[PDB]
């Protein structure tokens, strides 16, 4: 079978910038290579077929090139509405493998996260459970780490994280992290901390509460 890979997995660019993303096949595919564009919440749309042919009614800011194993999609001048995931597809021989996509996002200034911690609610605690939640909001760029501590020792068990896609108004990212414990164990310790490590500071941003 022919395997495909796309690089990079995600790229940030400015409006007006020339962008190039790439697709690589495991063997020569002779131009039998399709590109699709999938905007958030929408169906994929055909962009390029046969490596270099622009689909009817797509903008000529898009172009394809390549042959052999390596293919490129170029956008001559990025527009806001080009934010999407771009996929390649091998159509030489079956299976007609898709690459895993490249997400194209928008550049903006760096911002440190706004970090907020929350104890378990009374409602939850009346139930026997205890979830401690940390939001890391409105940061840029998207790479970030979160660490929980209970009375100063790191905890990894029972941590779940969720990350938003880029915000359509301010271009930031956000993350939600939840540490779940039994009410019985939450009661065995006093100090709960989430620490956010991000490129905007050499020190972590640390928020805490005491049960």
């Amino acid at each position: 079978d022919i395997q495909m890979t796309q690089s990079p997995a995600s790229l940030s660019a400015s409006v007006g910038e020339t962008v190039t993303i790439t697709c690589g096949a495991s063997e020569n595919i002779y131009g039998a290579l399709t590109w699709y564009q999938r905007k958030q919440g929408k169906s994929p749309q055909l962009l390029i077929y046969g490596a270099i042919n622009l689909a009817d009614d797509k903008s000529s800011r898009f172009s394809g090139s390549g042959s052999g194993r390596q293919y490129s999609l170029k956008i001559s001048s990025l527009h806001p509405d080009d934010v999407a995931t771009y996929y390649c597809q091998n159509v030489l021989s079956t299976p007609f493998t898709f690459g895993s996509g490249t997400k194209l996002e928008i550049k903006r200034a760096d911002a440190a996260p706004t970090v907020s911690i929350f104890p378990p609610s009374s409602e939850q605690l009346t139930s026997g459970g205890a979830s401690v939640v940390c939001f890391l909001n409105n940061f840029y760029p998207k790479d970030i780490n979160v660490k929980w501590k209970i009375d100063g020792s790191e905890r990894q068990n029972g941590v779940l994280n969720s990350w938003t896609d880029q915000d359509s108004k301010d271009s930031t990212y956000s993350m939600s992290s939840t540490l779940t414990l039994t009410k019985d164990e939450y009661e065995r310790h006093n100090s709960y901390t989430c620490e956010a490590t991000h490129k905007t500071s050499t020190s972590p941003i640390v928020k805490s509460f005491n049960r």
Binding site: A32, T34, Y36, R38, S43, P44, Q45, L46, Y49, G50, A55, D56, T85, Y87, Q89, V91, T94, P95, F96, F98, S100, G101, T114, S116, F118, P119, P120, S121, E123, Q124, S127, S131, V133, F135, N137, L160, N161, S162, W163, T164, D167, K169, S174, M175, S176, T178, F209
Partner: protein, 214 residues
């Protein structure tokens, strides 16, 4: 205008069955080959079935071959996908798509429908538990929505009023059930002073919770 409308999705147990349908209009349906493509929760795409114009020839990848059958009705202009022996990894958005007529020929999907959702799981419908997230010049509040199925909650703040400083965090699957959260940021002068409510709706369980933050 070309239109493709998929229906027949749903939620089933492992081993269950569905029959997807895609109604086509605005082109001569019987002239075109047609495909089903799925998008999994990891946002990967996979071609699952292709059928030719006349309906006599099909292709399926090994992932679904023997379990899925495509067919078509060239009178009423409908594409079908009969799915059987479903597995949790068949959970996906299923699209119908028309194959372009090209010379020389390439496989290219020039029109796609909106998709229909399929979920395959051992879970039953389960309402969320909804918990407020309050601190005890700006203030951040939230709602934790935990342990529900299937994955289809909506969370709004003061009935859409607070819109622009809201974050909705994508749901995570853990232990067969979903969990999500949502935040809002408002001025410290407006809370506790004016009320902030997160309205959480989960149609499958008929659950609407309008939770006031305190």
């Amino acid at each position: 205008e070309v239109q493709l409308v998929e229906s027949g999705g749903g939620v089933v147990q492992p081993g269950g069955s569905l029959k997807l349908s895609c109604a086509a209009s605005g082109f001569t349906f019987s002239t075109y080959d047609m495909s089903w493509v799925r998008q999994t929760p990891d946002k990967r795409l996979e071609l699952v079935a292709t059928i030719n114009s006349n309906g006599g020839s099909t292709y399926y990848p090994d992932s679904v071959k023997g379990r899925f059958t495509s067919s078509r009705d060239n009178a009423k202009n409908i594409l079908y996908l009969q799915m059987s022996s479903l597995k949790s990894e068949d959970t996906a958005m299923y699209y119908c798509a028309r194959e372009a007529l090209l010379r020389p020929p390439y496989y290219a999907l020039d029109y796609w429908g909106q998709g229909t959702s399929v979920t395959v799981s051992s879970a039953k419908t389960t309402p969320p538990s909804v918990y407020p997230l309050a601190p005890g010049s700006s203030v951040t509040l939230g709602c934790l929505v935990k342990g529900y199925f299937p994955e289809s909650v909506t969370v709004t703040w003061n009935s859409g009023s607070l819109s622009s400083s809201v974050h909705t965090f994508p749901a995570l699957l853990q232990s067969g059930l979903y969990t999500m959260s949502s935040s809002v940021t408002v001025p410290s002068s407006t809370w506790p002073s004016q009320t902030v409510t997160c309205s959480v709706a989960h149609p499958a369980s008929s659950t609407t919770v309008d939770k006031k933050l305190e």
